[PDB]
Design a protein around this ligand. Structure first.
Ligand code: A1BCK
Ligand code: CL
Ligand code: CL
Ligand code: CL
Length: 163
């Protein structure tokens, strides 16, 4: 584990992360997809061999020795707010189990269900809070990746508030 486990946020492409493993914001069918998923496909295409997995789950596939944890958040266009909230929390709990099993000291993670799966709603606080609930009991250094300047500021504020 990390000597003093921390949370940090960076505004940049997660495909250029400086961590020991990455979490992909995957679709259930293991397709190249869009956004983070397409960037992950271009950087680690080998990790998409048998990566299909249901909503609310995570499935790890190596690219060489580098782990890619495919986490499938719900598409809020399809689920009700109640059911989607439950599956979003579940996807993050499965990420925590995989990070622990892998024994890594750091992990790069995006905010699940905040892009094309958001159903057109701002889900920063909802997704980030489920990320904290799952990852708080792990000892890996967590680095959250985002692309928007206002989101970077809000995530950074939420991290610092708890310290
Ligand atoms: O790329 C994202 N979501 C993926 C869900 C499956 S997909 O439709 O292929 C795109 C992101 C999540 C957060 C920021 S971007
Ligand atoms: Cl970048
Ligand atoms: Cl998304
Ligand atoms: Cl963002």
């Amino acid at each position: 584990g990390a000597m003093a486990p921390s949370y940090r946020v960076k505004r940049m492409d997660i495909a250029k992360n400086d961590e020991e493993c990455v979490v992909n914001a995957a679709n259930p069918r293991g397709l190249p997809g869009d956004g983070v998923c397409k960037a992950v496909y271009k950087k680690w295409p080998e990790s998409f061999k048998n990566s299909a997995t249901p909503v609310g789950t995570a499935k790890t596939v190596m690219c060489g020795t580098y782990p890619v944890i495919h986490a499938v958040g719900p598409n809020f266009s399809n689920y009700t707010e109640s059911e989607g909230d439950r599956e979003l929390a579940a996807a993050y709990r499965e990420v925590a189990k995989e990070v622990t099993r892998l024994g890594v000291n750091s992990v790069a993670i995006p905010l699940l269900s905040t892009g094309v799966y958001s159903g057109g709603k701002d889900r920063l606080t909802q997704s980030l809070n489920h990320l904290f609930t799952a990852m708080d009991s792990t000892d890996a250094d967590v680095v959250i990746y985002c692309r928007d300047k206002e989101w970077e500021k809000k995530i950074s504020e939420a991290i610092q508030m708890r310290t």
